[PDB]
Amino acid sequence: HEAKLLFLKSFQFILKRQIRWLITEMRFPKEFEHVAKIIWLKILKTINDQPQEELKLQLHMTSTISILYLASTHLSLPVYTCDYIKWICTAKMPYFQASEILPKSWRIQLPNYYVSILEGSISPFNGQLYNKIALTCGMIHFKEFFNSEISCQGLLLKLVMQCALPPEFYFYTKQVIEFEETDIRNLTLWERTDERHTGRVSNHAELRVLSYFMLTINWMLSFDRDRQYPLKWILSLTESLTQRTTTSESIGRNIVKVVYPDKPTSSDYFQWSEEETLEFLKWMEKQFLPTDQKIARRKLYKIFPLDREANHDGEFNDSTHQLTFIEDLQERYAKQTPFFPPARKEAIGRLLTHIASQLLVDFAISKEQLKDCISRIKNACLHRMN
């Protein structure tokens, strides 16, 4: 009943810091502040709609990302929940460890279970980022006031370059989209204030784009009478795709495999390389800035200086240690040059595990969550035509 407003006094102030990070550094516009403030203030009326007698307000760290995702689709931005979980688990916008370092004066009177929720306790998993969006579009009506128009062209330009496929699949998918679609445009963002039950329809818009990217890449390769996509090129795709590299997208992707403990291909750190373990620890430098028996600890780090004792990478350093994301592809695309059945489809099945698990880590869902998304797209694409 009381100090629930004390949460509210800083749950905007942390969200003040989530967005001012995006504005000052990642070039996000000043209007993005104001788009979210309509999104911010309307849920306070929903709390004001709740009686103060036993209100039990429903705010979590999954909320402050979900209301930060809806401001990106009203502005029609190419930033997504793969471009949020890659900017939070890589310790870039303050999602993780928010209770402990952000207030600095408002901290102490907050109770113990409230201050527990406000820091970045876990990372969201298996549609927990999605079901809150379903609870966000429903509780405050982002529908019927705003535009819930997922710019899917701004989403699958990424998914071409994630795994280095030729750009025909950008339009091969598009006509699979434009065949099986109610209302050709506008994959619908879903709203739910109805009840607490996950409806097993997979009505999330960004969820269903991926199944269109899953069913296309099998159909354009298994049924190829045109012999334009040869098997030996597939043998030069997955062999060139299952290949580690040290770009900052890849290094940032390596952090994302770390954080999720439930699934396999999470104990993937054993296969790390020579260069990979340097910058992973230079990333770990950017965890301690988020994260009377005290001069002993000062005495401890006199014998472990964080820099190297000599020959560090400070000033007279290199030409380039690390290359950019436009240049690793110039080694990937300049590798699989050959371009012009039981064992053909198995070499397609190599990609079937590989690209659908690489997808599975990028968006924080389980394999059963993508099991629903194929069995309700493929069994719904057939029923429309048959």
Cβ closest to other proteins, residue 62 vs residue 336: 336
Binding to other proteins in span 229-258, by CB under 8 A: 248-249, 258
129-137, 204-212, 308-316, 358-366 -> range binding other proteins (CB under 8 A): 308-316
Structure tokens at 48: 């004001």
By CB under 8 A, residue 385 contacts other proteins: yes
Residue selected from 75, 115, 117, 234 as contacting other proteins according to rule CB under 8 A:
75
By CB under 8 A, residue 46 contacts other proteins: no
Minimum CB separation of residue 214 from other proteins in Å reads 10
Count residues contacting other proteins (CB under 8 A)?
A: 118
Residue selected from 270, 318, 319, 343 as contacting other proteins according to rule CB under 8 A:
270
Residue selected from 55, 330, 331, 380 as contacting other proteins according to rule CB under 8 A:
330
Residue selected from 117, 161, 231, 323 as contacting other proteins according to rule CB under 8 A:
161
Minimum CB separation of residue 34 from other proteins in Å reads 5
Structure tokens at 268: 């993937």
Minimum CB separation of residue 120 from other proteins in Å reads 6
Cβ closest to other proteins, residue 303 vs residue 319: 303
Structure tokens at 92: 């870039």
Cβ closest to other proteins, residue 138 vs residue 349: 349
- 61 neighbors 98 (Cβ within 8 angstroms): yes
By CB under 8 A, residue 55 contacts other proteins: no
| DSSP characters over 232-296 | HHHTTTHHHHS-----HHHHHHHHHHHH--SSSSSS-GGG--TTHHHHHHHHHHHHHTT---SHH
Minimum CB separation of residue 126 from other proteins in Å reads 12
Reduced DSSP (H G I as helix, E B as strand, rest coil) percent helix, strand, coil of the chain, to 5: 50, 0, 50
Count CB neighbours of 184 within 10 A: 8
By CB under 8 A, residue 336 contacts other proteins: yes
- 360 neighbors 366 (Cβ within 8 angstroms): yes
By CB under 8 A, residue 58 contacts other proteins: no
Cβ closest to other proteins, residue 201 vs residue 258: 258
Give dist(CA 211, CA 193) in Å, integer. Answer: 26
Q: How many CA atoms does the CB half-sphere of 333 hold within 13 Å?
A: 13
Give dist(CA 212, CA 377) in Å, integer. Answer: 8
> Taking CB under 8 A as the rule, which mask of x and - marks residues 211-230 in contact with other proteins?
-------xxx-xx--x----
Residue selected from 51, 196, 281, 383 as contacting other proteins according to rule CB under 8 A:
281
- 93 neighbors 87 (Cβ within 8 angstroms): yes
- Identity of the amino acid at 216: T
Cβ closest to other proteins, residue 75 vs residue 198: 75
The SS3 assignment for 121 reads: coil
Among residues 284, 281, 254, 258, which one has the least CA distance to residue 91? Answer: 284
CA distance readout (Å), 215 to 17, 45, 52, 69: 40, 43, 50, 26
Minimum CB separation of residue 278 from other proteins in Å reads 7
Binding to other proteins in span 167-206, by CB under 8 A: 167-168, 170-172, 175-176, 179, 185
Minimum CB separation of residue 334 from other proteins in Å reads 6
Residue selected from 44, 59, 101, 323 as contacting other proteins according to rule CB under 8 A:
44
Binding to other proteins in span 102-141, by CB under 8 A: 120-123
Which own/partner pairs from 128-132 qualify as long-range (CB within 8 Å, at least 24 positions apart)? 128/62, 128/364, 129/62, 129/65, 129/66, 129/69, 129/81, 129/84, 129/85, 129/364, 130/81, 130/204, 130/206, 130/207, 130/365, 131/192, 131/198, 132/60, 132/62, 132/63, 132/65, 132/66
Minimum CB separation of residue 332 from other proteins in Å reads 10
Per the listing, tokens 């990424």 go with 158
Minimum CB separation of residue 206 from other proteins in Å reads 15
Binding to other proteins in span 12-41, by CB under 8 A: 12-13, 16, 26-29, 31, 33-35, 37-38, 41
Residue selected from 199, 272, 313, 380 as contacting other proteins according to rule CB under 8 A:
272
